[PDB]
């Protein structure tokens, strides 16, 4: 179907909701009837994982500049639920709040963990928010 053997993709671990860089190694039937089998780029040793089509995307690397961020946008961004001031994983999220002074910028989003959602997370890496194609 939509993504091809050997295509570089992002794949979402449906347990934890985070997206990781991966490669399609095999495509089988069960687009909603397609199963992607992927390997994560720096972990050949961890084998192949089966993904539903909704948990695979082309690698979208279009940054949305600070000024263009808007409340209500569903975007891809970096968050760490266990240490919220630190670098974490990549998640889908809906921008919920945006605040700026001359010296400070704050961004809040409702982060999707697949299982639950996490409203108004404070997002630290406001200059690495990415667009979702869709
Ligand atoms: C947006 N992004 C994503 C992933 C990355 N490793 C990197 C970016 C940006 C740099 C590395 C995984 C899923 C989305
Ligand atoms: C670090 N990591 C983690 C998970 C992954 N699926 C992948 C990585 C790296 C690529 C795939 C689940 C929890 C942590």
Numbering used by the authors: 133 to 162, 179 to 282
What does the paper say about this structure?
Survival of motor neuron (SMN) functions in diverse biological pathways via recognition of symmetric dimethylarginine (Rme2s) on proteins by its Tudor domain, and deficiency of SMN leads to spinal muscular atrophy. Here we report a potent and selective antagonist with a 4-iminopyridine scaffold targeting the Tudor domain of SMN. In order to understand the structural basis of compound 1 recognition by these reader proteins, we determined the crystal structures of compound 1 in complex with SMN, TDRD3 and UHRF1, respectively. In this study, we identified some low micromolar antagonists with a 4-iminopyridine scaffold targeting the Tudor domain of SMN, and compound 1 shows >4-fold selectivity over other tested methyllysine or methylarginine binding domains.
